[PDB]
């Protein structure tokens, strides 16, 4: 379960970072109108 | 690879905000006190 | 001649665009060699200060 | 009008300070970064409200 727990935690961190990047891109795309 | 990317981006961001804090202190001494608190708010 | 107001609006639009470009570079570049990244960010921060 | 000038200077300084603090948030704990983002926008919005009363 040890390798599987580390594996899942690192995957969660990875797509959390990816989702944060995508959210940043979406926020800039939305807020460019208000610029 | 994802972990190495995370560590490298953490180091990059750390140097980014360190340099930005240093220069904001340099050209704007009057805002020096909150900036350190900002570090205390982040670190 | 160009009006002081129109120049001020061009300046604040350029400032917003510069912040957007700087943060986009940060988001898409964090991880490029650290020295080149640091030099480019120092240039961007000097640009921020000058625009200010 | 000097009061409005000094208010806009202190608001710009606070906006730069909040931008620095927000990018630090992105650096260390970006998960709650939006918690400050809109806040900064409000200041920008308040600068835009001053710049709207400034039209007539």
Tokens at D37, concatenated = 């983002």
Measured N-to-C along each axis, helices D2-28 and C4-29 cross at an angle, to the nearest 10 degrees, of: 10
Give the resolution value in Å.
Answer: 3.3
B/e letters for C22-38, b = 16+ CB within 10 Å, e = fewer, are bbeebeeebeeeeeebe
Interface-testing mutation among C3, C11, C12, with chain D (most D C-beta atoms within 10 A): C12
Distance CA B10, CA D23 (A): 12
Answer whether D20 sits within 8 Å of B38, measured CB to CB.
Answer: yes
DSSP string, C2-44: --HHHHHHHHHHHHHHHHHHHHHHHHHH----HHHHHHHHHHH
Way the structure was solved: cryo-EM
Answer whether B3 sits within 8 Å of A10, measured CB to CB.
Answer: yes
Q: H helices of D1-56, where?
A: 2-28, 34-53
Distance CA C52, CA B39 (A): 23
Report the number of secondary-structure helices (H) and strands (E) in chain C: 2, 0
Whether residue B37 contacts residue D18, with contact meaning beta carbons closer than 8 Å, is answered with: no
Tokens at D38, concatenated = 């809109």
Q: Residue C33 region, left (φ>0) first, then alpha (ψ -120 to 50), else beta? A: beta
CB neighbours (10 Å) of residue A7? 10
Distance CA D28, CA D8 (A): 30
CA distance D19 to chain C (A): 10
Query: Residue written as tokens 């580390």?
Result: A6
D-chain residue closest to B38, CA distance: D21
CA atoms within 13 A on the CB side of C14: 12
Residues followed by a break in chain C (C to N exceeding 2.5 Å) are 31
């Amino acid at each position: 379960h040890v390798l599987i727990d580390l594996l899942n935690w690192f995957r969660t961190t990875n797509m959390n970072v990816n989702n944060c990047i995508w959210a940043l891109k979406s926020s800039l795309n939305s807020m460019t109108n208000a610029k | 690879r994802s972990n190495q990317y995370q560590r490298g981006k953490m180091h990059g961001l750390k140097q980014l905000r360190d340099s930005l804090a240093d220069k904001i202190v340099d050209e704007f001494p009057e805002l020096k006190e909150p900036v350190e608190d900002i570090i205390k708010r982040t670190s | 001649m160009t009006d002081r107001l129109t120049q001020l609006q061009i300046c604040l639009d350029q400032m917003t665009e510069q912040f957007c470009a700087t943060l986009n570079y940060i988001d898409k570049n964090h991880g490029v060699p650290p020295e080149e990244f640091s030099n480019t960010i120092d240039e961007l921060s000097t640009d921020i200060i000058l625009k200010t | 009008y000097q009061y409005k000038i000094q208010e806009l200077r202190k608001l710009l300084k606070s906006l730069l300070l909040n931008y620095l603090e927000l990018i630090g948030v992105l650096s260390i704990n970006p998960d709650m970064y939006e918690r400050k983002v809109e806040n900064i926008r409000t200041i920008l919005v308040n600068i835009h409200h001053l710049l709207n009363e400034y039209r007539p």
